[PDB]
Design a binder for this molecule. Structure first.
Ligand SMILES: Nc1ncnc2c1ncn2[C@@H]1O[C@H](COP(=O)(O)OP(=O)(O)OP(=O)(O)O)[C@@H](O)[C@H]1O
Ligand SMILES: Nc1ncnc2c1ncn2[C@@H]1O[C@H](COP(=O)(O)OP(=O)(O)OP(=O)(O)O)[C@@H](O)[C@H]1O
Ligand SMILES: Nc1ncnc2c1ncn2[C@@H]1O[C@H](COP(=O)(O)OP(=O)(O)OP(=O)(O)O)[C@@H](O)[C@H]1O
Lengths: 343, 343, 343
């Protein structure tokens, strides 16, 4: 009956994205974004959601769920795959939200980016930034690139994540992934340890604290290729942001350094497609002879004009002329309506 | 005799709003706002108000009432309903103030708002703000809306409250309610956990600390519909307030963000009615094509002029022309007498 | 089989720079900068990388790897040499990165610097600064100089390092090396203890905190010859930097003091050579009668012009006219292209 391992069975069996456990109701499941209660077998759950949750939690997690009202952790079931779990107290009673963790890195062509992007993965050092709002394929793009390196280079890759989304098998290189909160205390002191761990590639899950970006740039300018993720929407947004989070006492020297070490920037958005509904739009900036200097001279508004690698709106039109994204979709995604409509 | 469970019996039997326990007197009761001592059965209470209070308190509550001079907690009696209890030391002796907690969410038509409000509950993401002073129906309006969603959408609703006023049954969706101080340490780290708990709707009981509003806006602009409650009196008050509690280093960018994500604002006041005495007045602002831009350009005084959804005074006149609220009632409730009197 | 001591055997046997231990894969090895998995003997490693790592760790290290997710430590195997080890948690599982520590200080002529440098090692007191980015031979140059003193002077040398790179045998003098994190708590309170330890020569591994540079300069101006290492690229960079990290309340008095006590500055870069690939370029400034005063009068841009000891670009041309470093190599290494190309 009420066995967590069997609840999971039925969830993937129905292609569920999430499962939810709360007292009053039977086990719930999110399918296509709709919550459905799998009455199938299990009946309305007693306060012994606590019993189910526990059958999955470590001892330092159960400790934690007491010290504070919630835990965020991952667990693996050999049968199927891996799962992210947030357990918490609801109405004096125990509640849980399990998520499915991706079991397979997509092929690069599957994504939507051009092959001009893959050229970044061959650069010897510098910063590769993939940005965009939560749910625009940032983690996917990175995983595709890190695994592309993994297939082709004899490197030592190190990733610092929150949480570990996709997982890597050893191939031509040797991959180590560290989860903040489980393997290490912080992005920062993990990235600091990373400098002494002989890595070829370093991947910061997120760069939200300044101290991290400060270590992230240090690494980049010291022989490493570093992958980083922001939440910005354009490329100019990105460069402006990481600069304008430093004290303006040598914020100009950030612009100098970034301009040497910034290797490429990809900003992503997932718009609805006409087939299966899933299409990626993007801004792409791989700096060259000219671009490099404009950033040093902080002439960023004039940078946009040289961009013919490809501006965000150009990606929108290209996706429209072929016939995938609609006009208003192409318009609501657009940073500036004025550049389009002209198309 | 002196049995807490029986005292409660007699209180609802007389339709009491509160019951009060203190040493010198017999158990007291608030009926229609007047304190009456139910001599009925129980006699003048000994210092063993402590005995009664305890028969209702958890162990971490009795601990707390020692560590500090008071506790605030909720407890449920299957017989009738749920009760909020504040226990504290009076004159070296134990005292208690129990409140009745609402056992049934009202129908939306019962309230007083138009059906234009219910359209908010269908919005995919953004901020729904219900404001007003304590005792203007904020919690009621929200409960009516969250339960309306609950009846019609297959969502996962999460509320973070202080305390949990109304309680929800699972219906078409799956509802989780977390009480700050019992299930979680803070609004903020509960709202932070909320982001990882796969919710469709998030409800912040109160947004008094900036850090909360900062997370609340983040959630809103990241795919969630978020319900929030202030203490402001007008809609312009509201927008001005949440903006002017951010450091003015990017306080202008709050105005930009709010204008994209602010879905509707309802400000409420409960004026005396001629029948049973209970009528709601309100200001309603659902932004559209034009309004959106005025807020970005911080032209808020000119926003008022476009409002014909409905200004606070228009609600007052409408309630008067029909014959419910008196002239001075309509005047003392009014933000500006000058707009009315002209009616 | 799986014996750490034997894994090491095979690594030096193949002339490895690093060895890497992680669960999924067999023991890895970096040869010529390429990761190769030595399937030779050991098979795919179980989570009992933990077993191997432990056979090398002290008790306060194994404690540490628990308190925090990683340790950085050194260990010695009589058979071959010494090894730097960073152990850390990867995917809930134990991972390790061992480095080879240099077993023999090079002859000074082997380096690339002129004999004008060795004259510094005979100075009675002052500051000798070797600078450059990680991997430009800073530690080598110092070790060559300290050991040169060791062979010829009856001194008491003290070094404070992070970690102890090269190790010294007692010769004509008596050498003491202290590792920050193992023998002492900090560079600073080690340098502070150094003042009371009767040393002739003091060597600060790194001078990143101001408090250190403040003690480092104190020592210099108090009878000691002090060796220090920065990350700057030019000599003017160096002097400007250490000055501009003091509060400008008496930052001018730093310029006065530095100008008395700065004995020499060497800034290094390792460019690719045509033979074995390994050649050193450098900027050299040994102040004299005139130079001393220019620094007091902060006329540093005019200092460059008097430099005919030798400017960075002059070193580049000299290495090119002989035929070692290529034009673009000489150009990309150059601080200013404009000075060269004229050659
Ligand atoms: N380029 C793409 N085209 C179509 N679908 C994609 C693409 N990238 C990702 N997806 C899908 O969309 C969902 C969200 O992707 P992903 O998690 O990579 O984005 P993200 O939220 O920016 O990353 P993160 O996990 O760091 O927040 C996933 O289920 C993924 O399979
Ligand atoms: N629209 C309304 N019309 C008439 N009576 C109402 C209305 N809304 C609430 N009431 C009644 O008035 C009292 C106060 O309502 P409520 O507690 O919702 O207001 P509030 O104090 O603003 O909310 P909160 O509990 O967050 O302070 C309740 O007893 C409720 O039944
Ligand atoms: N002058 C030189 N010429 C050729 N090779 C050198 C020279 N100096 C050092 N090397 C080699 O280059 C590598 C890096 O040298 P070293 O570690 O001294 O530089 P560094 O990184 O500046 O010092 P540190 O250990 O303080 O970071 C070593 O393997 C060393 O053998």
């Amino acid at each position: 009956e009420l066995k967590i391992l069997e609840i999971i069975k039925e969830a993937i069996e129905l292609g569920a994205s999430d499962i939810h456990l709360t007292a009053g109701a039977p086990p719930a499941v999110r399918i296509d974004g709709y919550i459905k209660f799998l009455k199938d077998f299990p009946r309305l759950t007693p306060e012994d959601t606590q019993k189910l949750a526990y059958s999955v939690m470590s001892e330092k997690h159960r400790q934690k769920l007491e010290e504070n009202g919630q835990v965020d952790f991952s667990f693996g079931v050999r049968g199927v795959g891996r799962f992210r779990a947030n357990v918490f107290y609801q109405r004096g009673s125990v509640a849980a939200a399990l998520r499915s963790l991706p079991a397979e890195i997509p092929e690069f062509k599957k994504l939507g980016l051009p092959d001009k992007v893959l050229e970044l993965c061959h650069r010897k050092m510098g910063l590769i930034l993939v940005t965009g709002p939560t749910g625009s394929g940032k983690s996917t793009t990175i995983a595709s690139m890190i695994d592309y390196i993994n297939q082709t280079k004899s490197y030592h890759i190190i990733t610092i994540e929150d949480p570990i989304e996709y997982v890597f098998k050893h191939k031509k290189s040797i991959v180590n992934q560290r989860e903040v909160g489980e393997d290490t205390k912080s992005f920062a002191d993990a990235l600091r340890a990373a400098l002494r761990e002989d890595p070829d590639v370093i991947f910061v899950g997120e760069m939200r604290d300044l101290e991290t970006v400060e270590t992230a740039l240090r690494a980049a300018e010291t022989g490493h290729l570093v992958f980083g993720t922001l939440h910005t929407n354009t490329a100019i947004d990105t460069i402006h942001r990481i600069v304008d989070i430093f004290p303006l006492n040598q914020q100009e020297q950030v612009r100098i350094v970034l301009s040497f070490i910034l290797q490429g920037i990809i900003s992503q958005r997932l718009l609805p497609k006409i087939g299966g509904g899933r299409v990626l739009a993007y801004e792409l900036l791989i700096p060259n002879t000219a671009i490099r200097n404009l950033i040093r001279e902080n002439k960023l508004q004039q940078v946009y004009s040289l961009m013919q690698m490809q501006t965000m709106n150009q990606t929108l039109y290209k996706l429209y002329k072929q016939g995938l994204i609609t006009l208003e979709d192409a318009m609501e995604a657009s940073p500036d309506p004025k550049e389009l409509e002209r198309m």
